[PDB]
Structure formats: C-alpha cells, structure tokens
Scaffold this active site. Sequence first.
Site, PDB file in Angstrom:
ATOM      1  N   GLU A  68       0.990  -1.023   0.287  1.00 54.91           N
ATOM      2  CA  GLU A  68       0.368  -0.049   0.311  1.00 54.91           C
ATOM      3  C   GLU A  68       1.195   1.074  -0.079  1.00 54.91           C
ATOM      4  O   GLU A  68       0.850   2.021  -0.733  1.00 54.91           O
ATOM      5  CB  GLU A  68      -1.283  -0.127   1.267  1.00 54.91           C
ATOM      6  N   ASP A  88      -0.283  -4.813   3.497  1.00 55.25           N
ATOM      7  CA  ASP A  88      -1.214  -3.956   4.364  1.00 55.25           C
ATOM      8  C   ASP A  88      -0.422  -3.503   6.040  1.00 55.25           C
ATOM      9  O   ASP A  88      -0.336  -4.736   6.007  1.00 55.25           O
ATOM     10  CB  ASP A  88      -2.318  -3.684   3.755  1.00 55.25           C
ATOM     11  N   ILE A  90      -0.367  -1.903   7.942  1.00 49.89           N
ATOM     12  CA  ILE A  90      -1.587  -1.567   9.134  1.00 49.89           C
ATOM     13  C   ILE A  90      -3.005  -1.767   8.328  1.00 49.89           C
ATOM     14  O   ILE A  90      -3.384  -0.689   7.112  1.00 49.89           O
ATOM     15  CB  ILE A  90      -1.352  -0.105   9.532  1.00 49.89           C
ATOM     16  N   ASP A  91      -4.091  -2.373   8.366  1.00 54.41           N
ATOM     17  CA  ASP A  91      -4.979  -2.124   7.347  1.00 54.41           C
ATOM     18  C   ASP A  91      -5.857  -1.923   8.908  1.00 54.41           C
ATOM     19  O   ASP A  91      -6.309  -2.495   9.693  1.00 54.41           O
ATOM     20  CB  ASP A  91      -5.036  -3.407   7.268  1.00 54.41           C
ATOM     21  N   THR A  93      -5.861   1.967   9.510  1.00 60.03           N
ATOM     22  CA  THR A  93      -5.293   3.122   9.457  1.00 60.03           C
ATOM     23  C   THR A  93      -6.030   3.851  10.046  1.00 60.03           C
ATOM     24  O   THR A  93      -5.988   5.016  11.656  1.00 60.03           O
ATOM     25  CB  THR A  93      -4.334   3.897   8.197  1.00 60.03           C
ATOM     26  N   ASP A 218      -5.763  -4.979   0.683  1.00 60.46           N
ATOM     27  CA  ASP A 218      -7.017  -5.350   1.915  1.00 60.46           C
ATOM     28  C   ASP A 218      -7.889  -6.665   2.187  1.00 60.46           C
ATOM     29  O   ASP A 218      -7.827  -6.748   2.488  1.00 60.46           O
ATOM     30  CB  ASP A 218      -7.696  -4.465   1.600  1.00 60.46           C
TER      31      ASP A 218
HETATM   32 MG    MG Z   1      -3.180   0.398   5.393  1.00 59.73          MG
HETATM   33 MG    MG Z   2      -6.444  -1.815   4.093  1.00 60.34          MG
HETATM   34 MG    MG Z   3      -3.939   3.508   3.935  1.00 57.48          MG
END
Ligand code: MG
Ligand code: MG
Ligand code: MG
EC number: 3.1.3.25
Lengths: 274, 274
Positions: A68, A88, A90-91, A93, A218
């Site tokens: 990402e 990802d 940090i999915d 944020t 994601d």
């Molecule tokens: Mg993220």
């Molecule tokens: Mg995400």
């Molecule tokens: Mg983001």
Amino acid sequence: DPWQECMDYAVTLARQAGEVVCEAIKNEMNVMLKSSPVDLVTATDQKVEKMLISSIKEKYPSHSFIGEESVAAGEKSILTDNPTWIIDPIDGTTNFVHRFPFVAVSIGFAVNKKIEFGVVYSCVEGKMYTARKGKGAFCNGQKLQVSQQEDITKSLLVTELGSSRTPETVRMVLSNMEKLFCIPVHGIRSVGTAAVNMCLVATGGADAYYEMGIHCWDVAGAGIIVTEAGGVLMDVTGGPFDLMSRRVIAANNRILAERIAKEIQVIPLQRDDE
Amino acid sequence: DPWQECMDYAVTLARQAGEVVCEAIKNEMNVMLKSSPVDLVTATDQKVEKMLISSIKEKYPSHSFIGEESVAAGEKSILTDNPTWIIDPIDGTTNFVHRFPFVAVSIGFAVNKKIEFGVVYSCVEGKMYTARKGKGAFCNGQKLQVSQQEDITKSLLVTELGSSRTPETVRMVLSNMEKLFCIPVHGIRSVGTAAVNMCLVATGGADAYYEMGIHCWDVAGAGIIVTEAGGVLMDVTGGPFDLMSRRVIAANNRILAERIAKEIQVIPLQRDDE
Ligand SMILES: [Mg+2]
Ligand SMILES: [Mg+2]
Ligand SMILES: [Mg+2]
Ligand SMILES: [Mg+2]
Ligand SMILES: [Mg+2]
Ligand SMILES: [Mg+2]
C-alpha cells in the site's frame, strides 16, 4: 513445502509488525494525509511496510512485492506469476489513529496470480489468523468454519463506508446499504478494517462481507482465510473474484453471495492493474 | 458509600449472567420475534433477566426494576425515585444469535431518577466496564479516559441502524449518517450494541456515539461509564440527556456532541415513560 517456510516467516514478520503497531498505538502520533483529509497515513504505516519488504527481500530476493505505502510512493501495483507478497502494513489506519481496537497487519502471498497463503494479525486483540491453500484456516491454532446460514433474511453482514466523500459515491454506498438492509437482513456491522471484517466471516461470527473501493492489499491475506474456512469469494457483479478489481463479496456460501450481488449497484473505480 | 455494596453485587451478578450468555452462545437456539422480523429474543435473554431480578430481590427486596424482557412481558416501564435496577440482559441479541463477538449484560442503578452506578459486561471479549458517580470509570480495573478531539472532521463516530425496517425510518437514519459522514468525519463504526458502542467512547477508542430508537435499558449502564471517563451525555436536540427519551448523544465533549446535534434530524418515537 517451500511455501510453508515462507508462510512460517510471514507469521514471524506479522507478529514483529504487530508489536511495533501495538507499541505505537499508545503514543502521540503525527497524522499525515494521503488523497484527502480522511485518507490517513502515519510514520508507523511507512516504517512497518519498509521493515516487511526489506525483511522478505533479504531472505527471498527473487520475490515480488505489492505494498500500500510503496504504491503511494510511486510503485506499480501489477500482479505477475512470480511469487508476490501483497502487504497492508496497517489495515485500519483510521482505527489506529483513534485507538479503535481493530488494527491488522495483512500479508497475502501469490504464486501464478493465485493466493497460496494469508496472514492477518489483529494485534490489539492478539489474534493471529492464518490459512494455507488446502490446509484450513486458523485463529491462534483454533480451526475456523464459516456459518451455515442460507437464509438472507436471517443473515448478518459486514461492510465499510469507504474513503470517498464524493456526494455521488456516498449516495451509491448508502443506497446499496439500504437495499440489503431492507431485504431485510438481521443487520450490518463495521469494525473499520476489510481484513478483520473478512476474518469475522471466516469465524462464522458474520455471514458475509462486501465492499467496493478496497485494494488487492486489503483482501489478499483474508481472502484465503475465508475460503479455507469453507467460504466463497465473488465479484459484486456475481462474476469470478478478481484481486485487482477493487470489488469483493466474501461470504459463507454462494447463496448469500449471489443474493448480495443482485442488490449492489457497481461504483466506477480505477483498477489496481491500470 | 451506601450504594457501593449494591454496585459490588451488580458486578458479581453481571459476571454470572455473562457466564450463562457465553455458554449459550456456543449452541443452536430457537429465535423468537418481537416488534419486527429483525427484533430478536431468545430463551437466554429471558432466563438471564429472571435470574438477575430474582437475585436482586433476594438481597434488596424494596428495590424496583426496569427490564427489557420484563417490559416485553407487559411490566410497567416506569421510573420512580426508589432505587431502581435498569437491565438489558443481553444488549446485542442479534450479535448473540450470530456469535458476532460483542454481547453485553448491562445494569444501570438509579436513585431519585439519576444514575449512581453502571456495569456493562462485554462477555465474549471478557471486558467488565464499571463506573460509580464521582469515582471514575474502569475496564477490568484500568481507569478510562475519553479522547481530547474537538474537531468533528478528525472524529470517529459509533452508531447503530436500528431494529426498524419501516422505509421512512430507515431513510431518516441513513440520511443522518450521510450528513455526518460528509462533514467529513474520519469514519463511522457499528459493533452491534449501544452499551458496547458507549463503552468504546469511554475508552477514547471512538470520539462519540449517537442513536435514536434505543431504550433506557440500552444506555442506563454505559451513560455513567462515559461521564465518569470525562465525557458528556446530551439529547439529539442539544437539550439535557433524558433516559426515557429514546435519544442519545454520548461524546468525549460538548463541542463534538453539539456539532452532531446541529447536523442531524429527530426521528419521532414513543418515550419509555409514555
Ligand atoms: Mg493500510
Ligand atoms: Mg487497508
Ligand atoms: Mg491507508
Ligand atoms: Mg437486550
Ligand atoms: Mg439493548
Ligand atoms: Mg432486544
């Protein structure tokens, strides 16, 4: 198998990343903006992604990556047949910035454009969700199974409102929500992360997840967790699931997935491969 | 403190109720209907409420009650000055039926029609939220504090869509969500229980909760948890919070609460005391 060693390393990395995230969530943070005042990024998202990619690249230099924050930095989100790590860092944020207790590190691993394994670490919960093709899905060693619900009127859905604030896009998202809501369905839930929403479907706690606007990173980790738990992935059109399409229905079964698809009107979105 | 003994007993009972709920959540169950095809009730909701009322009567025979399922059975939904136990035996019955992991036992205790203590046990998670007037709010012995956020465009909101499927009602609920969503706000979350949404605001994990359609029993336990964590309660009109009004804004502060009140439109509802 050789992919089991990759998967074992991915779990180790997801835990290390989760510890960093857990430590950072307690402290003050400089919230930065990406595409709009609601599309957030922190030094933590960027640091975690750099650590994950540099760690995997050192061990497997021939492997490819789709991350990402790397894509935000100018990298190409193109999926080839080569072993590819879809990250990802940090999915969730927005959840992270708020200390809302659902923050995930997601790692999906693709060979020949097909997911071989997935790792989703919900660090605040201390829940490590994992799945390997043909090996089943687990949460901290507990085998996962999707619910048996085939009646849409007795189903519980998960979704997210999205990062767009365009009045036209927002109306379409809420209209789609209204249609499903008035079938009726038992309810709609939102924990704030696609990866965790999908893992909830894999546990059987929710019957189906749907969203438009998500990206390959994601859903790459969680998709295989849903299918290895006995579930299904589909496009919102009812067609085959496409990782680069920005659209997903992740359900316990084809009956609910197809019924959801029939209510959804497609939002025009730039594919990850364009 | 003359109400500290009642509160100690309430914590014991909420935990005992939570063990019953946890055990029942693992098994298949008959699902009964109340006000709509999506307004659910089980033998567990009914059993837990009976167990709570009978245990309270054993120790405090002069005390009064307001319980969700007792009201459904035809009991008078009336708030007198007498010490009153306001009970939601399972807040999140839809979640409970689905094994969606947010299910709460809620007890609010009122004297002279004002809340003196609140207990909300999120049983699946194992989180016991408690607060006594002037003594602070806690989750498993850890002191709670609401967030500092005074800018609505940097806020994370929690809400629920409701048990009603009447098209006009659904239209208003989604319209209010759209207006807030486009201010913009960072996001909107829904875990499926008013009491747990409120407790998340007390922790600082969300900035504010709002809902129209709830009842005194949904909010009596958690309202004092929000206020003892440094937050505020307000009516959706901007006027003082009213336990029997079916309306609530529970926020970190008056600035966010007032902005939410200004932005949304009132849904007409039958008060719990009428
Ligand atoms: Mg993220
Ligand atoms: Mg995400
Ligand atoms: Mg983001
Ligand atoms: Mg209830
Ligand atoms: Mg309730
Ligand atoms: Mg109920």
